[PDB]
Amino acid sequence: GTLDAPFPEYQTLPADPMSVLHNWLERARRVGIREPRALALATADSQGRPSTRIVVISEISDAGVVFSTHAGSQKGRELLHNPWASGVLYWRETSQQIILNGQAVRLPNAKADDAWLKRPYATHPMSSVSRQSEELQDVQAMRNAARQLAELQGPLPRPEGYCVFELRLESLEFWGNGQERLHERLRYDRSDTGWNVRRLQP
Amino acid sequence: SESLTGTLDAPFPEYQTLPADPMSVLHNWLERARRVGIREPRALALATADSQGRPSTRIVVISEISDAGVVFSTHAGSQKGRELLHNPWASGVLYWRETSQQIILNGQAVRLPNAKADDAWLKRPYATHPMSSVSRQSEELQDVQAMRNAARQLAELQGPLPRPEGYCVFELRLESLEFWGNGQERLHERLRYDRSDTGWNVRRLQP
Ligand SMILES: Cc1cc2nc3c(=O)[nH]c(=O)nc-3n(C[C@H](O)[C@H](O)[C@H](O)COP(=O)(O)O)c2cc1C
Ligand SMILES: Cc1cc2nc3c(=O)[nH]c(=O)nc-3n(C[C@H](O)[C@H](O)[C@H](O)COP(=O)(O)O)c2cc1C
Incomplete structure (x- = not known):
């Protein structure tokens, strides 16, 4: 709660979340957020049990985000x-x-x-x-x-x-702390014509 | 860019000694974090899965450490x-x-x-x-x-x-845990535990 955290997207509802994503990452780098690209990445096994670990996002792509790892x-x-x-x-x-x-x-x-x-x-x-x-x-x-x-x-x-791997995105959420505990959730979902967008309840 | 920024010493004797009871390692690490002033040590990136096995994630806070695992609260809906x-x-x-x-x-x-x-x-x-x-x-x-x-x-x-x-x-009653330290010379120290019929099996994992 310690650096400025602007979220005008929550009011204006931009059409393209890839563009918001790029803007937030740029802001993170320029204000000097510590390891902003450390992604907690969840996958699941054949029973549908999740597993997690950190990986680093190395690029943003047209379809999503890109990381490297070992296949086995x-x-x-x-x-x-x-x-x-x-x-x-x-x-x-x-x-x-x-x-x-x-x-x-x-x-x-x-x-x-x-x-x-x-x-x-x-x-x-x-x-x-x-x-x-x-x-x-x-x-x-x-x-x-x-x-x-x-x-x-x-x-x-x-x-x-x-x-x-490229993680090609079907949905994203941007979350900010907001005011008076009304946390700000901007939620996007791919449609066959583009992206749909809604706010979520905190 | 792919680089880690951590500079604080982080003693991981448990990687050498392989304690039988992993909750003791969890308590050590959390108490160390408290003492050295880690920012929000208990912000947990929690994954669940939908009916087709598709993961989702968000941060929740661990409000307590129990005998079986860790506790958090949320909304059922x-x-x-x-x-x-x-x-x-x-x-x-x-x-x-x-x-x-x-x-x-x-x-x-x-x-x-x-x-x-x-x-x-x-x-x-x-x-x-x-x-x-x-x-x-x-x-x-x-x-x-x-x-x-x-x-x-x-x-x-x-x-x-x-x-x-x-x-x-919810109590997350643990069946497996890993403790991961940066190690030396990029030999990252991975201590993996898995529940047995009684107690726990422990091993090290390749970085
Ligand atoms: C800050 C940080 C960044 C990491 N970045 C990567 C990465 O980009 N790729 C990778 O394979 N492992 C990365 N690791 C190690 C992974 O967390 C994990 O130990 C390894 O990928 C094995 O995960 P798995 O056994 O769940 O597949 C990173 C670990 C840390 C703590
Ligand atoms: C630092 C931080 C801590 C949070 N702690 C909790 C919490 O403990 N319980 C909870 O329900 N949501 C918590 N949230 C909000 C969740 O991240 C998420 O917005 C909310 O639980 C809805 O998640 P879902 O739609 O995936 O179920 C926290 C958010 C932040 C950023």
Whole structure:
């Protein structure tokens, strides 16, 4: 409640939520919100049990948001059989949330190559040696094998399984704290002609 | 940009020692967070799922840590409430930027008796009662001013209101948890617990 938190969209109801999304992220970066792109990303298994973890949104796309992960991780396995996902951004400084609902699709390997090459190279060793989310049987062995690759110069090859997902959005909500506890919820839903928009009760 | 910003020391001896009882690790971490001044440590990004297994998320606050798990309150008619009533399975993550810690909490949410919900409602500062009484959380809001005006009328009272129908307390009774620390040299420290027939199985996970 500590930085300014303007929400004129709640009055004016903009037609295109992708444009609001881009505006909120720009405002977050320029006012210096701490890790605004840390998304709590929910997926579910074949019984419909949810799982969560943080991932970083690396781009906004025409259809949604983009992140990278490993295909054999829990989220990658869930996504493979059930593409429906939801993520939330929560910015403590302005008391704002963004809720993002949709289906995530794995992008082609060339896109993954590029994502990999644009990471700081210090991240290649461990992300190459680790099989994300599998049982870790020997900590020291992993540390030693990664140190072997850390010593090398330049980028490493993209490991099989390193992959990029686009979460193509079917609904979003923008949430602000409002006045007198009337929290402001702007809710958008894709239609076959564009986007529908409504306010929700707090 | 993909970088974490945490700089506070965050001792994670439990990654080496593998305590048998994961709720002790949850208590340690939460108490550490309290002592070092983490901002809103208990803002929980909670996921539930609809009848087709499609997830939804929002932040709720963990109001208590119980023997079985963690407690929060909400409205039974909300999206999360309707989802939990049909599919009790849920997952929440806490993430603390200052220490680079994450806590993932998975299990089944059970609605606790009304006496519990009465208690929880009463413990709320009564200033929160007016808006929570007039709002049917997550249904469309047709007229913002009518809502504001109606709460303001109730706020005249300057005291506790009766608990609304729908106001409720869920306990998330945990079946699995992960404690995640940044570790050294990007070997992120992942301590994973899963309920057994008695006690818990524990393992480490690859970063
Ligand atoms: C701030 C933060 C950002 C993270 N960003 C990513 C990311 O973008 N991609 C990723 O695979 N894991 C990321 N992780 C690690 C994930 O939370 C998780 O440990 C890993 O992806 C395995 O999740 P899973 O076992 O649920 O599939 C991040 C962790 C933290 C705490
Ligand atoms: C910091 C913060 C804490 C919140 N705590 C709660 C809470 O504990 N209980 C609750 O019902 N909603 C809480 N909310 C509001 C929810 O995020 C959400 O707007 C509301 O519960 C409706 O969720 P739903 O439509 O997905 O069911 C909180 C919001 C913020 C940003």
